[PDB]
Amino acid sequence: TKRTDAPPVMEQVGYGETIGMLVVPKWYGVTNNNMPIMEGTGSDVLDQAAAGHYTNTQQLGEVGNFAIAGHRRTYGNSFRRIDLLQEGDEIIVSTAKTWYVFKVTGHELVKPEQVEVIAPVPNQPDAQPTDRYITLTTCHGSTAGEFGNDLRWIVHAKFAYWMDRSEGRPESVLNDPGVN
Ligand SMILES: [Cl-]
Ligand SMILES: [Cl-]
Ligand SMILES: [Cl-]
């Protein structure tokens, strides 16, 4: 029961509070694949093996860009294998009420000052948004890749559909990432 009308918008929460869980089907067998997403991008969030929401980006479900940061090398849950994501791969956020399903549009390798990658319209800081995106960010090295940090690996995914979590879940989801 994939819904294509506008999804529910998450309300902004305080720093360090949990927004949901990140599930990426290509990371089944790689990580525990149930990475919490929390407000804020300090190490107090990312060291918890959680993804952090850039606080000046849009809320989950909101028109614009919900951007999250993750460590590349954390245990249990991380963005280690961000490099496996190709066009059309699913990026799934679970909240208490809702499954948000995004589909990868592309990736970028950028310098960390290239903040246009997390603008409301990805890579277009001057543009007003129409679509709903998620953006995942992590470190990458020009020489050392996974083990370097002169660059940032960026994945963009455009909203595809949503589901009421009490009524169903995506077919790719192999087990409940959370509780009910
Ligand atoms: Cl931030
Ligand atoms: Cl959209
Ligand atoms: Cl490097």
Side-chain angles (χ1 to χ4, degrees):
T1 162
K2 300 169 174 208
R3 296 198 61 177
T4 47
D5 57 343
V9 179
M10 297 297 281
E11 297 189 340
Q12 180 168 16
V13 298
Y15 188 96
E17 304 184 326
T18 302
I19 304 180
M21 278 173 159
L22 183 65
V23 173
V24 177
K26 283 205 161 163
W27 294 350
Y28 279 127
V30 179
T31 72
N32 301 354
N33 208 17
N34 65 339
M35 188 171 188
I37 306 167
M38 294 167 195
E39 181 73 357
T41 58
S43 288
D44 55 356
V45 172
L46 307 184
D47 281 8
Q48 298 181 61
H53 179 228
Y54 290 84
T55 60
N56 289 335
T57 70
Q58 286 65 63
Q59 308 308 322
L60 180 57
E62 183 174 26
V63 169
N65 191 4
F66 175 79
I68 59 173
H71 278 353
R72 192 78 186 266
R73 310 221 271 147
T74 41
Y75 179 86
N77 281 303
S78 70
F79 288 3
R80 184 185 191 186
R81 287 276 74 82
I82 196 165
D83 56 0
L84 299 179
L85 299 174
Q86 308 171 23
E87 188 191 359
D89 291 334
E90 280 180 342
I91 297 180
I92 302 175
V93 186
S94 69
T95 67
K97 301 183 189 167
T98 308
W99 292 97
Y100 299 88
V101 177
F102 304 80
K103 296 285 212 70
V104 170
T105 57
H107 83 275
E108 294 151 353
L109 269 177
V110 296
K111 289 165 281 132
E113 297 82 15
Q114 289 186 254
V115 304
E116 67 266 16
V117 303
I118 61 164
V121 183
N123 303 325
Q124 304 184 36
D126 292 78
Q128 285 282 324
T130 302
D131 291 322
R132 295 167 172 80
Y133 279 83
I134 191 173
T135 295
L136 270 58
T137 78
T138 191
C139 286
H140 192 77
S142 58
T143 296
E146 186 193 334
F147 308 88
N149 56 346
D150 66 336
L151 293 183
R152 305 290 188 267
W153 192 294
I154 312 297
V155 175
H156 292 127
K158 184 169 167 171
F159 182 74
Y161 62 89
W162 63 285
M163 303 181 67
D164 193 322
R165 185 183 189 166
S166 73
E167 302 177 351
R169 76 186 180 204
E171 283 288 309
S172 58
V173 163
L174 296 179
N175 59 96
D176 205 330
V179 181
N180 283 254

Coordinates of all heavy atoms in Angstrom, one line a residue, residues 110-115 149-152:
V110 N 32.7 15.7 -2.9 CA 32.9 17.2 -2.7 C 33.9 17.5 -1.6 O 34.1 16.7 -0.7 CB 31.6 18.0 -2.5 CG1 30.7 17.8 -3.7 CG2 30.9 17.5 -1.3
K111 N 34.4 18.8 -1.6 CA 35.1 19.3 -0.5 C 34.0 19.7 0.6 O 32.9 20.1 0.3 CB 35.9 20.6 -0.9 CG 37.1 20.2 -1.7 CD 37.7 21.5 -2.4 CE 36.9 21.9 -3.6 NZ 36.5 23.3 -3.7
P112 N 34.4 19.6 1.9 CA 33.4 19.9 2.9 C 32.9 21.3 3.0 O 32.0 21.5 3.8 CB 34.2 19.5 4.3 CG 35.6 19.5 3.9 CD 35.7 19.1 2.4
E113 N 33.4 22.2 2.2 CA 32.9 23.6 2.3 C 31.8 23.8 1.2 O 31.1 24.8 1.2 CB 34.1 24.6 2.0 CG 35.2 24.6 3.0 CD 36.2 23.5 2.9 OE1 36.3 22.8 1.8 OE2 37.0 23.3 3.9
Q114 N 31.7 22.7 0.4 CA 30.7 22.7 -0.7 C 29.3 22.4 -0.2 O 28.7 21.3 -0.5 CB 31.1 21.8 -1.8 CG 32.3 22.2 -2.6 CD 32.6 21.3 -3.8 OE1 33.5 20.5 -3.7 NE2 31.7 21.4 -4.8
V115 N 28.8 23.3 0.6 CA 27.5 23.1 1.4 C 26.3 23.1 0.5 O 25.2 22.8 0.9 CB 27.4 24.2 2.5 CG1 28.5 24.2 3.4 CG2 27.1 25.6 1.9
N149 N 39.7 11.6 4.8 CA 38.7 12.6 5.1 C 39.0 14.0 4.5 O 38.5 15.0 5.1 CB 38.5 12.7 6.6 CG 39.8 12.9 7.4 OD1 40.9 12.8 6.8 ND2 39.7 13.3 8.7
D150 N 39.7 14.0 3.4 CA 39.9 15.3 2.7 C 38.6 15.6 1.9 O 38.5 16.7 1.4 CB 41.2 15.4 1.9 CG 41.2 14.4 0.7 OD1 40.5 13.4 0.7 OD2 42.0 14.7 -0.2
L151 N 37.8 14.7 1.7 CA 36.6 14.8 0.9 C 35.4 14.3 1.6 O 35.4 13.7 2.7 CB 36.7 14.0 -0.4 CG 37.8 14.5 -1.5 CD1 37.8 13.7 -2.7 CD2 37.6 16.0 -1.7
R152 N 34.2 14.5 1.0 CA 32.9 14.0 1.6 C 32.1 13.3 0.5 O 31.9 13.8 -0.6 CB 32.1 15.2 2.2 CG 32.8 16.0 3.2 CD 33.0 15.3 4.5 NE 33.6 16.1 5.6 CZ 34.9 16.2 5.8 NH1 35.7 15.6 5.0 NH2 35.3 17.0 6.9

